[PDB]
Amino acid sequence: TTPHHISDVAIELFAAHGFTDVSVDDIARAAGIARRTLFRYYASKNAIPWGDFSTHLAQLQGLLDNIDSRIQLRDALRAALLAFNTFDESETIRHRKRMRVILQTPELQAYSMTMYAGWREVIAKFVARRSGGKTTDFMPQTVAWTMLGVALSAYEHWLRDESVSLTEALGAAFDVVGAGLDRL
Amino acid sequence: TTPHHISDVAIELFAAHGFTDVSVDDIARAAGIARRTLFRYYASKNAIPWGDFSTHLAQLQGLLDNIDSRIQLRDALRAALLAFNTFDESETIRHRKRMRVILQTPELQAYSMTMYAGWREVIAKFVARRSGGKTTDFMPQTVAWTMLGVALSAYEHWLRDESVSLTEALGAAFDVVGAGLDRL
Amino acid sequence: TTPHHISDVAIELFAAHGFTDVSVDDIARAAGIARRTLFRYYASKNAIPWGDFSTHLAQLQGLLDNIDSRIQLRDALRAALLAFNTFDESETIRHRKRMRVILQTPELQAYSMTMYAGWREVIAKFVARRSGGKTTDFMPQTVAWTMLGVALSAYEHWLRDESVSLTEALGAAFDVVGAGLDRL
Amino acid sequence: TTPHHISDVAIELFAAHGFTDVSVDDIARAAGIARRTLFRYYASKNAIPWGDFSTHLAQLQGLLDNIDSRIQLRDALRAALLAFNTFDESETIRHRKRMRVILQTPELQAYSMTMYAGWREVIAKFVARRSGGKTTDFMPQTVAWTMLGVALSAYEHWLRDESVSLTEALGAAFDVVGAGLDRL
Amino acid sequence: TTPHHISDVAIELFAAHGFTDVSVDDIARAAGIARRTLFRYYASKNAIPWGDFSTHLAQLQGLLDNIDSRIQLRDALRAALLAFNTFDESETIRHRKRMRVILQTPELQAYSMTMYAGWREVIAKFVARRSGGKTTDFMPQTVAWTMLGVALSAYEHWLRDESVSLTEALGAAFDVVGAGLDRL
Amino acid sequence: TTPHHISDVAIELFAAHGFTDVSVDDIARAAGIARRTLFRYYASKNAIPWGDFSTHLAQLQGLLDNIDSRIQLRDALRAALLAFNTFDESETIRHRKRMRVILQTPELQAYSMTMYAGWREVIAKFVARRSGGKTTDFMPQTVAWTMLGVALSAYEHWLRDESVSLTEALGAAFDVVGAGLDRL
Amino acid sequence: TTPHHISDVAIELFAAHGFTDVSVDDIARAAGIARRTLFRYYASKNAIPWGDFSTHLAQLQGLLDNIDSRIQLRDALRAALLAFNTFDESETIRHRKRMRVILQTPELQAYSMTMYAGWREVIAKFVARRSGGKTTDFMPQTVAWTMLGVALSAYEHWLRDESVSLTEALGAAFDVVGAGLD
Amino acid sequence: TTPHHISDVAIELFAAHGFTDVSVDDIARAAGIARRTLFRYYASKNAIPWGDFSTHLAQLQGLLDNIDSRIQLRDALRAALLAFNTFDESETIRHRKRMRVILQTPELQAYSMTMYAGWREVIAKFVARRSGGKTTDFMPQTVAWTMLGVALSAYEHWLRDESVSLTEALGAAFDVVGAGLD
Amino acid sequence: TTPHHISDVAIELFAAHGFTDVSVDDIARAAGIARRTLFRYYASKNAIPWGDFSTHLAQLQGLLDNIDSRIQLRDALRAALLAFNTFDESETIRHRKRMRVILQTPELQAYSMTMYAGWREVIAKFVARRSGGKTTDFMPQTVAWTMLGVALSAYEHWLRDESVSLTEALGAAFDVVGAGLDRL
Amino acid sequence: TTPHHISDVAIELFAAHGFTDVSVDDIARAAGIARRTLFRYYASKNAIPWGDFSTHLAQLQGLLDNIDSRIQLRDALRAALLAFNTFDESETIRHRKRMRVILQTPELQAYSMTMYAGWREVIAKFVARRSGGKTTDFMPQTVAWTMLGVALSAYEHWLRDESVSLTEALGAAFDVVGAGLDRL
């Protein structure tokens, strides 16, 4: 009905059963829509767990584009990383199920690589905007990949240990890389 | 009689014709083996571009085991990163083709994630051995992910621009993260 | 309930009145659609009994493409044959006891032979992909024809005797040929 | 041989011109008979490419009736298949033209299905005679259909190549299915 | 086993491909004979379009021997001319192709001259038998040449215009010369 | 030197030795010219005996074109036939050798047929000019062929019997056909 | 009464004891006949294991003579070879004992050579009948010898290895020669 | 002194008179030896026509053992078959008499069977050495039997028809089986 | 095998790129040697596709020396031809690439003629050794050249088809010339 | 004395100075012609030793085309081979004692192989025309190569020993191969 409603119901089904054992009609039925209605919002089954990531990416780009130019690069990246990954008690529970599906499902990895490249494109664009131009240059690209590593490290620590704050995990992972490998 | 021979032949075929249009028989035929003989070494077409990675990981462990304890953790990680991706003049051309297939083929990404997790496990073990113990701790884990991002950044820069040295690319990418984001 | 509904209604009138004295408009009228609406789903009267065979062929090819390469050729053929003949009592009635429009109508045999050639092309492609050179080589072609004979034998046994399971009929017919004529 | 003469003449005309552009009078004229005389041997145009066929089926029955009872069933089927499809260099040429017309002409397919059913009836009767059961049981029926598929595969291979022995093609095609799909 | 069969096959080939591009093996193969078997009946490719002309000349002699002596010389010549070129409905089409090859192919003209001389010898003998004796006398010789010219004129008119009867053409051409040039 | 000189010397050589055993250089040598000089006047060896027939045909056409319209067809043809074939004692001897070569040499017959068709074209044109139009109509064509038969009959009678006048032979042969076959 | 009953009885005795240690009277006694009655059916002890081979040869000739001419030569020979050697569980047991005594007894070899030459004559006659007709010609006779070797190879493999079907053994042995050493 | 000299002398006598009408003493006398001297080289009359076959078999084994492994099996067998049966005009004459006595004498057949089994053992060993190694296995032994039939077919054709080369006969007989009954 | 390794590597490069676009350093680099090290095994680029060849000729000499003297000359030549050209499925693949380079590359033809002369010298010596005479006599020389033509015919047939056994091709080609042109 | 004269003069200077250090102008100068006059007859330096081979090939094809079809294949090949190697003492000197530019010059071997392929194409076409399907089939191709080997063997024997007749050498070399290697 909303994209988000379809995604949420799909993630409940993927959490309970397999990803592989849940069909697109199972999702349509559980969401109370016709199958073709589902395809207006999602072109594929693999797209469904990645709910409205297009919008998340636009918002992250918006935040980074509008961050005051006097704010240092490191501070902007840490600020932006933690802003998009802060959640309420309710939305934290479904995000935990969603990330389990995304990170651990073999069939989602091809599609996920496209989503990660989108995210890295936003980060690299931001660095290119603050430095010399060209998203594909070494330094923007290294910063984007580094940031991706930080995030996935934090997400995995969070999933392994249910007592950890996601934003504390992200902050800690960021700080390793912020400080640098030359310092432990 | 080698996994390596099968892999080499398979990469030549995947480079020329694409991945999906190359059969497992095409590989067995080009390698001069029966189809079953191929399955002794590989349980899948998707496994084949990765060669004998189990042995590469054992030799990375060997290199890290034999680094002197007085050698600093950053130096050991940078030394191991660049050594693990140094190939004879013999093998530069085939490695370029191999990494194109691995990095760019959607069908390899599920399998690739397992291989990257293996590599990160070796790195994390080494860091835990030099710091407080526990492979799954946060930090000997952030370092492994960070180092993976550095590597993939270097590999992509290398593939995009043929006038880059791979070891220079890895060294440069490592040094961003080694120095830290706190220092531009 | 759009191409199917048209097909079901058509088979009713074809199974009611001579395929030759049922017109495309009679079918449109009985299905409650305009004449040109029917032509979006079917280019011809002869196409209507065959439903969406294009999709059945694509799905059979999809199943054979995606079968694990470690699975033997005989097992894959038997698996694929019996994977598309499972239907519910209702769907089975638009199929058994009653005879077949497809098998038994003289006017549809020329066209039906072209549809069977499509099916044999899927089978022969799969065999060629697992074993040898070209789709037109004798062995892929003999296997495709053998498979077609098995299928038509099973379909006729099923129509002749309404107490028999289609998938059991297919499995039994396959097993004669699997075991071989040298063991009768 | 009055029927055979008419058929031979008809097939030379069908080979040179269309099937559809050759009339029943064209056939009568080329055969040196009145139009009415042709109808004592053939009830329609579509019957003519099949020659006597009633007589070919009686001859196949005669050959199977006269095979020694001590000869095993597999050997008898292979022996009959290959003997029923043997000729001079001379009669091989007319048979190539005849089979092209039979296999490829849309208007002959309905009629051909009745001729194939006759042939399968002979084969199924023979199997029932050596094994017991009824002619309409699964195994005689599957063997008859299988043998038809073998034959059409052989015929198509033979037509597409023209360096190929028909009896070698039939023997090879039979042997795949004789050995069984459990082998190749 | 027939000269006629070889000739018929050869004429079909010469019509489709031209004379020079058809080999003696192409003829032996199409006729279903060994190459040496062809040379029993023909000592040359150039001989083949002329079939068993020796026998046609013996049968022309037979027809002229059996014409009643009371039948006038002109009537006998016209009767024999038209009978010698009358062919069954069976053979009109093949005779059209045969005469095209004979009349129009440069390579056949040397051989053809020998066959025309044979025919003229039969005619001249007959005229000498009805008049004063001596085959080589002037007049039973002029008549033979004149009759040959009449025939070839008729044949060419027949080939040029498919709506001409050959026997009407021969009869008309004969009648010019029969009536004489003294009468328009 | 002249075309006629080359032809005359060629005919002396063809008379003494074979046609087949005399080469084009033998002719060039005996005529006292270079080989390429011979090819300015003759495109082929086969053309050489037919010396300046192009000119003979133009002259025959000229004579027939200019013959008074009141002169009857028969008279014009007989007049023209005998005018072009009248010769002195010297030129009669070489014409006898030339016609022997032309009429009796197998290798000249293809080329000769083209020359005879040229001659017949002149005759038929003349008849078409006096009657209704179209050289290819039946009557002009029959008259041309008849005239050719007359001529060859006369030439052969002349060659067989050295005591005969060529113009008397032509006149006698003409008169058979002029009178008509209805009168002996 | 029957030569084959006498042969069957004789082969049971030859299987249990020696060939060499079984007398002609032992066989007469076991078969329920007088000694001279046995000699009306068999002129020698060496003849007895080859029971009514004369009849087997006539039957083989009959089968080969009556095979349809359109059936190819290799198919006819393979079909004929396997038809005479297809046996019930019961008849398989006595055939195994019979062939053991024939193939392994030195004293039977002279007589056996004459029986094999009879068999080869049937095969060569069949080939001569389908090709040019002289039974002593090269190909008729090469085919007969080859087929004899195929058969004896199959029989020996069959006796050596109790897991093997006789008709499978014959078919496999035939197929090596029918295919070719290539 | 030589076993083969004794055999050669014996075969000249067997060719001229019967096998059956030539005694062992007749052979001793013709060979210029005492009777017991003959028995040191041959334990039996039946052994004598098969002269020094033990040595022929060792030589055949030597030749087959030493054929290069890259040479295909059919070529090796055909090459070996024709090498042992290539003879000068002189040696052809005595070989013809030797094979006539061996192939046609009933009394030699028991002994001959043992010699043929020796020959087949050499062939089967060679095949086992190139393939999986057990000399009693099916294919080793089918090939040995087949090759025996080829050889005897060639020998008999050769004896029947004085216009035929032995090596041509063997090559032709080999080629039927090497090609196939197809 | 140092020479063979360099040659194998060189042929993979020559197959992928040109002959002309592959340098001696490219070969040294791919073989994992200094440029100077390559020159101890090969005196030029054109030598490299031929491998050791000196050693192949010594091996052919060894094989012919060790063929038993009682083996007839024809059998020894056929045996040597086929043994010298035998391989695994593996080494068949490299040999196909090698022979393409040897047979098709203009710059190798001069050098190839010297290699062919070496091969013919071995064959001619062997024939002289079995027959007497000198190596340079007509018959040894003709047999060596004939055998070279047989081989190149076989090699070309093998390259153009790829379903063909090299040893079958050689055996067939040998047998035409073994049997003689007096047959086929 | 125009393309020949150029060739003769060229061979003199080539047989005088290194083919490599004789230029196209030296040849034009020594022949007494302008440089561009030479290029009307020869497109290249490599063409000059080969004379007018285009014409030799056309003549060999002409001889084979026109050989009586009753003549056996072996006889036709031997006849054709020895029909073009007859020369006068003078023409033979521009051929024997002295060695060959064509056979012995390294720089002309690549080009010479293309000229030999032309010759083999003539031979193979002739064989295919007498016997089978395509020029590229094994037997026509083997016969052409065999024939080439025979020729080169004869040419070398002729050059090595100036007392030998070329046609006797060719005939002897042919006869080895005609008789066959099975009779050495």
From Swiss-Prot, chains G, H:
The keyword Ubl conjugation does not apply. Coiled coil: none annotated. Residues 1-60 form the HTH tetR-type domain. GO terms for biological process: regulation of DNA-templated transcription. InterPro entries: Homeodomain-like_sf (IPR009057), HTH-type_TetR-like_transc_reg (IPR050109), HTH_TetR (IPR001647), MftR_C (IPR041347), Tscrpt_reg_TetR-type (IPR023851). Pfam families: TetR_C_14, TetR_N. Keywords: DNA-binding, Transcription, Transcription regulation. Residues 23-42 bind DNA. One of its GO terms (molecular function) is transcription cis-regulatory region binding. May regulate a gene cluster involved in mycofactocin expression. Mycofactocin is a conserved polypeptide that might serve as an electron carrier. This is Putative mycofactocin biosynthesis transcriptional regulator MftR. The gene is mftR.
